[PDB]
Amino acid sequence: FVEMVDNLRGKSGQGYYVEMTVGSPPQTLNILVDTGSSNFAVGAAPHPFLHRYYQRQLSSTYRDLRKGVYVPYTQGKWEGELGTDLVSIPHGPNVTVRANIAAITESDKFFINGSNWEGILGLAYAEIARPDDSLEPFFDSLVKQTHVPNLFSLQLCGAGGSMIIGGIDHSLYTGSLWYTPIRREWYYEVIIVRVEINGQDLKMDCKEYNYDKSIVDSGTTNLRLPKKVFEAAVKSIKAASSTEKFPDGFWLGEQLVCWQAGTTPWNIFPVISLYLMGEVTNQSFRITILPQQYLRPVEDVATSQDDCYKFAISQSSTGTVMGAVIMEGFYVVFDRARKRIGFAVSACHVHDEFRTAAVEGPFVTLDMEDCGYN
Ligand SMILES: COc1cncc(-c2cccc(CNc3cccnc3N)c2)c1
């Protein structure tokens, strides 16, 4: 795991990527690590934003599955050809697997102009794979064909990171790991059973927090909350920070807020605690997020020279998404073998002058199942 430490590059803004090699002889690509999707899909044609792409026909081990795939989003898509090839992770375990690969032949609003990655490693489960759940996701192939344990953990830093494949590295976190159950193997779905701001219960029905699901998603920048929860949260963060006025635009992620370099008044901004369903009946634990995780610094803007931040909490269309902004505070263990997700304070988390992040428990929370939306 020493050899996997620091094997990710990038930021929460454009995502985190891992080097992979596909085919024979090996072709080296940077691949977004995305726990909110389940396809392994790589640029396979010279889209102008791409540094590198997959040239199937130069791989002696490529096998055309003679089947297309099509994945749409709200305002875009990617599209391509399914096949299999030999895959590896230079700074991963010392194995080669034959995996399903979607050779992206055409796409729209998918690749980010200026990014240094060319594909997507969908680490979530087969149920949300495209074109259907019979397209075995990458991690499933890795585990089936090798003795690599069926887990991985992510330490996302910035504001790069590490993906430890096959276990847990003690040196990437402090304190103890607490585990929340994966509710259904599709997205990494979890249950938020309670939310607090500076220790103050947000006081809503916990079904609101998971309406219609809550997921851990390294392919999303922000903490995203459902509409009602988002409004409750912002009102409360306004209240804790009412000694200053901010434009409405700020709370909508449209405008920055700046202070004289070094004078950002962090104390004004509250810690958010999300309680997660525990492994034991009526037991939960809490993860504590600090303002320096949801106030994301904004660098050279037009031409900026102060200290400036945008609000990295946003409204959710499809439930609570624990994006990179949240994951960046923690070492997140995706224990697929035991249907569970572990959190511990990250060794690389941004500290704050007077407050320290935490993962802690146990708490008693009755009727936690009822926080699940059905
Ligand atoms: C922080 O990770 C990202 C930041 N910016 C863009 C992406 C990105 C780009 C293209 C496709 C995808 C697919 N995955 C999504 C998309 C939307 C929401 N969640 C996920 N997992 C991500 C990831």
Curated annotation (Swiss-Prot):
Q: What is its main location?
A: membrane
Q: Which residues are glycosylated?
A: 94, 113, 282
- Tell me what controls its activity: Inhibited by RTN3 and RTN4.
Which cysteine pairs are joined by S-S bonds?
A: 157-348, 206-371, 258-308
Task: List the stretches on the Extracellular face of the membrane.
Answer: 1-374
Q: What's a single GO BP term from this record? A: detection of mechanical stimulus involved in sensory perception of pain
Keywords, comma-separated and alphabetical: Acetylation, Aspartyl protease, Cell membrane, Cell projection, Cytoplasmic vesicle, Disulfide bond, Endoplasmic reticulum, Endosome, Glycoprotein, Golgi apparatus, Hydrolase, Isopeptide bond, Lipoprotein, Lysosome, Membrane, Palmitate, Phosphoprotein, Protease, Signal, Transmembrane, Transmembrane helix, Ubl conjugation, Zymogen
- Topology relative to the membrane: Single-pass type I membrane protein
* Modifications the protein undergoes after translation, according to the UniProt entry: N-Glycosylated. Addition of a bisecting N-acetylglucosamine by MGAT3 blocks lysosomal targeting, further degradation and is required for maintaining stability under stress conditions. Acetylated in the endoplasmic reticulum at Lys-67, Lys-203, Lys-207, Lys-213, Lys-227, Lys-228 and Lys-235. Acetylation by NAT8 and NAT8B is transient and deacetylation probably occurs in the Golgi. Acetylation regulates the maturation, the transport to the plasma membrane, the stability and the expression of the protein.
Provide the active-site residues from the annotation.
34, 217
Give the UniProt entry's GO cellular component terms.
axon; cell surface; dendrite; early endosome; endoplasmic reticulum lumen; endosome; endosome membrane; Golgi apparatus
Where is the protein situated, by its record's location annotation? Cell membrane; Golgi apparatus, trans-Golgi network; Endoplasmic reticulum; Endosome
Residues that the record marks as modified (N6-acetyllysine) are 67, 203, 207, 213, 227-228, 235
Q: Which reaction does it catalyse?
A: Broad endopeptidase specificity. Cleaves Glu-Val-Asn-Leu-|-Asp-Ala-Glu-Phe in the Swedish variant of Alzheimer's amyloid precursor protein
Job of this protein: Responsible for the proteolytic processing of the amyloid precursor protein (APP). Cleaves at the N-terminus of the A-beta peptide sequence, between residues 671 and 672 of APP, leads to the generation and extracellular release of beta-cleaved soluble APP, and a corresponding cell-associated C-terminal fragment which is later released by gamma-secretase. Cleaves CHL1.
Free-text note regarding domains: DXXLL motif is required for a proper endocytosis and retrograde transport to the trans-Golgi network, as well as for regulation of lysosomal degradation.
Record text on subunit structure and interactions: Monomer. Interacts with RTN1; RTN2; RTN3 and RTN4; the interaction leads to inhibition of amyloid precursor protein processing. Interacts with SNX6. Interacts with PCSK9. Interacts with NAT8 and NAT8B. Interacts with BIN1. Interacts (via extracellular domain) with ADAM10 (via extracellular domain). Interacts with SORL1; this interaction may affect binding with APP and hence reduce APP cleavage. Interacts with NRDC AND NRG1.
Supply the name of the protein. Answer: Beta-secretase 1
Q: Which gene underlies this protein?
A: BACE1
Parent-protein start and end of this portion: 60 to 446 of 501
